[PDB]
């Protein structure tokens, strides 16, 4: 039984037809986050989506990816045993601090890039990167960041592109996805550009309350660096945002290239 090996304690978080609770593996004494999904509320198709997310999590072992340690199916309940990460989402911390210093944003994006690079080398594309699902080890400056929520992730064959469907989060969507073009790994680096812009000034590069006009902004790469807040941001921060928010997906910087950019490598 799940309850034979793990003891449940307090709720840490709440999803649709899911909760997250702190748990201890009894024999080990080790603490984990248990995502408990009510599979009574899911069709076969959506059960199988859950088993796919678990399988992709199992492929990925990396200090900046939330590690799935176990996946247990019981009558009406599925349990996903993750690393316990208690720092809350990157999103909440950006709102609390308003924006990050270049030193803190650089250390943050460097870890995201290592994680994305690992995903891309394993043939996994997240498709849905955003501060909302990047988890912090703590509220302390320089805290380790981890990628979470592989529920929309896909597997690609080498550098081959294909139409993998319309999915992700509106404000973070790549122009190639909005065009319905075949796509691959670069969609993640567009999302990294959006995340980096948000990190440095605390608002997104693309937004309109009209989703059509939001989508026209993204497809046209219509963002800028308004004064006064962007006046004190280094040209190299801007240059790395520009190479990530490149509409052409072949010209757009890769995770491997981003890790060599002077704003990452020459601190």
């Amino acid at each position: 039984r799940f309850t034979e090996e793990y003891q449940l304690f307090e709720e840490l978080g709440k999803g649709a037809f899911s909760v997250v609770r702190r748990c201890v593996k009894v024999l080990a004494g080790q603490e984990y986050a248990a995502k408990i999904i009510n599979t009574k509320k899911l069709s076969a198709r959506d059960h199988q989506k859950l088993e796919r997310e678990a399988r992709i999590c199992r492929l990925l072992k990396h200090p900046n990816i939330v590690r799935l340690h176990d996946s247990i199916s019981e009558e009406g309940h599925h349990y996903l045993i993750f690393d316990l990460v208690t720092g809350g989402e990157l999103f909440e911390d950006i709102v609390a601090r308003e924006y990050y210093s270049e030193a803190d944003a650089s250390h943050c994006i460097q870890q995201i890039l290592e994680a994305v690079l690992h995903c891309h080398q394993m043939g996994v594309v997240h498709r849905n990167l955003k501060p909302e699902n990047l988890l912090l080890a703590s509220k302390l400056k320089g805290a380790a960041v981890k990628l979470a929520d592989f529920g929309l992730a896909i597997e690609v064959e080498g550098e081959q592109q294909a139409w993998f469907g319309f999915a992700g989060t509106p404000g973070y969507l790549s122009p190639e996805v909005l065009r319905k073009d075949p796509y691959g790994k670069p969609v993640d680096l567009w999302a990294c550009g959006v995340i980096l812009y948000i990190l440095l000034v605390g608002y997104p590069p693309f937004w309109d309350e009209d989703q059509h006009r939001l989508y026209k902004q993204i497809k046209a790469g219509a963002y800028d660096f308004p004064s006064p807040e962007w006046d004190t941001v280094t040209p190299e921060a801007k240059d790395l945002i520009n190479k990530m928010l490149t509409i052409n997906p072949s010209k757009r910087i890769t995770a491997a290239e981003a890790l060599k950019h002077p704003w990452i490598s020459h601190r």
Partner: peptide, 17 residues
């Protein structure tokens, strides 16, 4: 700055609710 311009950072769900 974000606060002086009254800009907001608001969480977004995925397309696939």
């Amino acid at each position: 700055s974000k606060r002086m311009k009254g800009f907001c950072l608001i969480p977004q769900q995925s397309i696939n609710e």
